[PDB]
Structure of DNA polymerase processivity factor:
Amino acid sequence: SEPPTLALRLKPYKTAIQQLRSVIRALKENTTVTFLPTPSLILQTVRSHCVSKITFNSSCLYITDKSFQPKTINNSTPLLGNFMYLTSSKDLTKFYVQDISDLSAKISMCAPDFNMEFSSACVHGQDIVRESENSAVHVDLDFGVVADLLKWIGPHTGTVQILVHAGPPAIKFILTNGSELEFTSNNRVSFHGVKNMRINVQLKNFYQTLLNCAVTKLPCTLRIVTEHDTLLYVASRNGLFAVENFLTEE
Amino acid sequence: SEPPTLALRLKPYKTAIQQLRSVIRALKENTTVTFLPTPSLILQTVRSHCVSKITFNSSCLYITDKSFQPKTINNSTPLLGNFMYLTSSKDLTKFYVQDISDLSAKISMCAPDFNMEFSSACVHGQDIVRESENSAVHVDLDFGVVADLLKWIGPTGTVQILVHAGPPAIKFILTNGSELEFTSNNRVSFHGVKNMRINVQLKNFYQTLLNCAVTKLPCTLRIVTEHDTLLYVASRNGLFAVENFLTEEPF
């Protein structure tokens, strides 16, 4: 009778997008929203050498029928504009996606004397970057430390080089001007395996990577993967979502 | 279209809301949208002693079935926000309203790979202010005269509109003193006049002229003395009509 349905649980979902107000507003037209039957909801923004991804905890999602097929639509929607931003309305009383067609997702949203329904074309030909769980250098950073890096890059623009040292453990951040901000192994930075590795990434993709993780106001886990090409991984999460970023060398 | 359907003709409608972009964006949460089977679409904003109304020409509408019941909703929509502003999308490809429930209006909108429909509750405690075709004073003003009045009120206050009978003259006095008055010439037409005085808030009067100025055509000023001394200021074009209704202030 009814089609496969993926509903959002609004008490956790509405607290997550309020925490994400800053990021939800600065998405651009390169941003996809993917619905999976895990259940999972994934926001992805792909760019030149950077990929950021926000994954809502299954805590926020409820799925009717696991034969729901994966849907990926654009966030920039032909009449409503910013789809995610429009789910941050505080009037929202019901929010679910149905799998009617193989070509489109049907989204339903309610408010007190209002109900809307729309259908966006599915994008077939988009992938979602995954954390390779192999990592050569793995470094946890205090949220206080992340605020320090933010306040130190807050006038951008340039390039940043991230060096990580073995004995003793330390992570250092050198800028194209010269300025260096280093942290040593204390109680604000944990080192899960830091032999000697270095990456070079665009400074504003690193700065924006930090703004995304800072929305959780918790620790971030920074890593350096040496697989295909030296990839910088920067992630933070809370009990409602997880922010992941993937930057490659310049 | 089994249920009665009121469709918009997008070529004329899209050009009408583009002329109206200044008005569409400054509507507030007191603003009503009315769909009639005339066919007609009406934006009404009621305020203290001013009522402004924008009526889209029937030329902009196409109606299926005249048993479409009159629907009035709020322009301030619970998740989309400004309803009229969202019809101003240049991505819009299809826009019609259907009468399914007595309790709500069902609006459908399409764009290239997109199609939505929503239903907002209809409000029933509101009427549409009408032009009483009685008028004691009826004075048409060339758009030049209206542009002149605008470029003189831009800098609270109670403008008073005094009109003389023999011969015709209309005068606009401010609380400071300055007066801009005009005699029967080529840019002011005088049909019906009477020795009359009205006082209206200057802020509602200036905005009334800003709304009519959007047509860049003549404006029709009137003063109705049927129930209560009302100032009426209107300008139409081939796509819509801007009407304003001002009353005097109480002691």
